[PDB]
Amino acid sequence: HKIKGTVVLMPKNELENLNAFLGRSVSLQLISATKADAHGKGKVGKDTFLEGINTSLPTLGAGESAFNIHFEWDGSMGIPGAFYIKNYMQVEFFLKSLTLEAITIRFVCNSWVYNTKLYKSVRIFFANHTYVPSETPAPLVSYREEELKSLRGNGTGERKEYDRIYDYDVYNDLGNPDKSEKLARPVLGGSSTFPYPRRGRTGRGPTVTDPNTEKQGEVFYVPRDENLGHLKSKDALEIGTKSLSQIVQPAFESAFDLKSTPIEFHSFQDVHDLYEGGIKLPRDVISTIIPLPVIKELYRTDGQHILKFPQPHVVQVSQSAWMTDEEFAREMIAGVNPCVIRGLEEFPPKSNLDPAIYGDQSSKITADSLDLDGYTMDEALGSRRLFMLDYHDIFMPYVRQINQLNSAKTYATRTILFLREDGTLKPVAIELSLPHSAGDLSAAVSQVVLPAKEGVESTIWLLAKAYVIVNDSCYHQLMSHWLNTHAAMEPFVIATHRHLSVLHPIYKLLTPHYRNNMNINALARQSLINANGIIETTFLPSKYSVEMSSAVYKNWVFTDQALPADLIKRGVAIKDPSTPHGVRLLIEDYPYAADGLEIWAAIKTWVQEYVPLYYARDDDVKNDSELQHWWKEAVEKGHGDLKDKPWWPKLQTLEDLVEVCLIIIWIASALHAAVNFGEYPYGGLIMNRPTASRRLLPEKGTPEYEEMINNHEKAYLRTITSKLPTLISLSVIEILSTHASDEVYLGQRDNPHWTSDSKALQAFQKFGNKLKEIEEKLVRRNNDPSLQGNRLGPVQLPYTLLYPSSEEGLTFRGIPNSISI
Ligand SMILES: [Fe+3]
């Protein structure tokens, strides 16, 4: 009756001896998928313990250990399709897999197994077979549904480290009212005032001063297997933000309070010095930073007084190129935030904001003042050569409250761009707008600034570009990055674990694209977007930052996240059935869009080849109970504040299923990579990507105006992010722009046996081959001299953000499967 099996596991001291696992320390019980008891449930075998350590196969790394085990299983017990496991040891271990031979049967587990007394029900694992609900072997049907009920929990209770309960809650855990009324923040989600995607429920309970806000916690829970261990401490990048906010930031502050370093940058060279000779800090400040995991990888040091940041890619060839109008415009199509620019089809541009509240909103930009390389405005409009980076309606509602803050002053900006005959974009005007209402104490007014290369006019134009980029950096960080990827994706991760069994084909299709997302999001709610957290203390909006993202979410549209839909909606492409991708770009050499369409196409082919393997007709999608409950919950609960919108796909057809999966995979992989991995490469020079502005343009006749004339670099530095928040911000984006060495990229999976279905495996193989094919093509584009203007620019920085592959580090390339940092 014996079945020879091999158990691979990792002792806790590996992701954060052997003989202790033997004896009666760990028992497994096989469950039959073909032979059932009197209740239709698969028969269960006897408790079998680990017999010995297997030291036979070389292919076994990652601090993993193999154990031999034999089960009493007669042919009459049917075929095993699952197993129970109980850990009698005090300390948890990481279960990798179980492999049964003559009968091969593989089980991919990758799950922490805590002491048996901590679990309400015994941990169960299934073989690597894939089944839509109606295809589940009858003896496993109930076990499948029971595991899902276990994962859903009951919606109450404080979640614990070892819990594996997935549920939703609103963002009511960012404020810290018990510490100070000044740290109170509006609850985001669950109201018409503040709609917002839901996040993972933690259940710590209410604060003492506000029943609607969740109390503080030293650890923000995520279902256990969402918290990724790492073999190398340097790869635990997500812990970096907590260390930065709680340990490093206070250390930097003391250096400034003690006046051990100049409080402000006084010249552009003071900024360049950070990645050259470095910055000198107090000994104890260096000593506080140098020993921390992850943090110590951010700077080179002499071990005593110096911290040196790495040279950002944007200055590696020319340290002054960022100041060119050419690079300013190019970064709108190949920079850190390449997805906001829109076509402009009328002139002057219009506003939908209420003039009764903000004053006359007519644009003050006159067509006759613009240099369109000889084109008349009507010619530029008609030839589709006019574009804009429009933050006017987005920022105007918040300008008054932001400008009331100390050290924060902004404009609601609009930039007009012209597509030159040579295919590059050039900036032709910037409008710096302020709201005007009766009784305004401020005398500052709106103004239009035009390009200028000499005189005070050139300084004013450089400052106008800085106000625009402060708007762009804020929108990029809070919306393009945080809202559209991190926050938007979490509800789908939760729904997937709550309603699609690990056996489900769609679960297998989508879960690789969720790796580390709930984990980084929980760490973000704790240290990145919390009251007085990193973002609030480094970006322009301060305490209004996260709520601004809620106002933007009001207009978030799931189907508009598809790349073709996005391009068409923004007026940078038109539908064209005669083209390979179904769309014709209006900026032919738009790096992000051109490379993105290649990746989008590859993902679509993959999804279109996968789905058919499990759903033959539209009725098969309509009748999948798990799939229907999954989608219904993702929409009505996860993104519930928008359940009233008409645009949600129905999921009653193969077409809709493909669409939904394609968009989810796109957001998690390529979209997030394109907006994330260029953060330090472009933003590592604070002048190129300022996060905040502290004053408006000066009045003629004041010393500030005189300063623009006599010391333009100081005028610029006094206007943008101060030195202290710059040091913190550079540190944060350096972490976010780094690829951990254990990352899993698009076209890869953590285990070659994720499914036993050879056809699904074949399809995945073709997808990976296609991505390698695409990379060769993108390499050719970057090497094409005719595309240099937009793909490299004056900074001579080849656009590699959508190259699928990458080695570890701050590489400016590589597409991870998920939002993993
Ligand atoms: Fe990210």
Identity at 2, one-letter amino acid code: K
Q: Where do you find CATH 4.10.372.10 in the chain?
A: 250-338
Distance CA 365, CA 581 (A): 36
Question: Looking at the DSSP assignment, which residues form a beta bridge with residue 251?
Answer: none
Distance CA 664, CA 489 (A): 8
Using DSSP, state whether 271 is helix, strand or coil. helix
CA of 486 to the centre of ligand 1 (A): 6
Distance CA 808, CA 775 (A): 17
CA of 676 to the centre of ligand 1 (A): 6
Q: How many helices (H) and strands (E) would you count in the chain?
A: 27, 22
* Method of elucidation: X-ray
Q: Which residues are catalytic?
A: 481, 486, 672, 676, 821
Nearest one of 688, 572, 596, 590 to 330, comparing CA atoms: 590
CA of 820 to the centre of ligand 1 (A): 7
DSSP-derived secondary structure for 402-468: HHTSTT----EEEEEEEE-TTS-EEEEEEEEE----TT-S-----EEE---SSHHHHHHHHHHHHHH
Give binding residues as ranges. Answer: 481, 486, 672, 676, 821
Q: Where do you find CATH 1.20.245.10 in the chain?
A: 473-819
What CATH topology corresponds to 150-249? Answer: Lipoxygenase-1; domain 2 (4.10.375)
Resolution in A: 1.6
Distance of CA 283 to the CA centre of its chain: 35
The CATH label, of 3.40.50.720, 3.40.50.2300, 1.20.245.10, 3.10.20.440, for the domain at 473-819 is 1.20.245.10
Question: Looking at the DSSP assignment, which residues form a beta bridge with residue 69?
Answer: 5
CA of 290 to the centre of ligand 1 (A): 25
The neighbour count for residue 614, using CB atoms within 10 Å, is 21
With a CB cutoff of 8 Å and minimum separation 6, the contacts of 145 are none
Domain 4-149 has CATH 1.20.140.10: no
Q: What is the β-pairing status of strands 279-280 and 168-169?
A: unpaired
Question: Looking at the DSSP assignment, which residues form a beta bridge with residue 583?
Answer: 575
* Neighbouring C-alpha atoms within 13 Å toward the C-beta of 720: 32
Cβ 554 vs Cβ 548: under 8 Å: no
CA distances in angstroms from 389 to 289, 386, 419, 510, listed in the order given: 39, 11, 13, 34
**CATH, domain range 250-338:** 4.10.372.10
Distance CA 393, CA 413 (A): 9
The neighbour count for residue 468, using CB atoms within 10 Å, is 25
Domain 339-472 has CATH 1.10.600.10: no
Give binding residues for Fe cation as ranges. Answer: 481, 486, 672, 676, 821
Give, as residue ranges, everything with CB less than 5 Å from ion ligand 1: 676
Please provide residue 399's backbone torsions phi and psi, each rounded to the nearest 5 degrees: -60, -45
DSSP state of 561: G
DSSP state of 182: G
Nearest one of 175, 167, 174, 155 to 198, comparing CA atoms: 167
Q: Copy the structure tokens of residue 616.
A: 């033959």
CA of 632 to the centre of ligand 1 (A): 27
Backbone CA torsion sign across 183, 189, 190, 195: positive
Please provide residue 699's backbone torsions phi and psi, each rounded to the nearest 5 degrees: -85, 145
Distance CA 385, CA 426 (A): 10
Distance CA 478, CA 500 (A): 30
Distance CA 733, CA 679 (A): 6
With a CB cutoff of 8 Å and minimum separation 6, the contacts of 681 are 312, 313, 314, 336, 737, 797, 810, 812
Q: Copy the structure tokens of residue 129.
A: 């077979």
- Rounded to the nearest 10°, the torsion over CA 314, 484, 598, 325 is -30
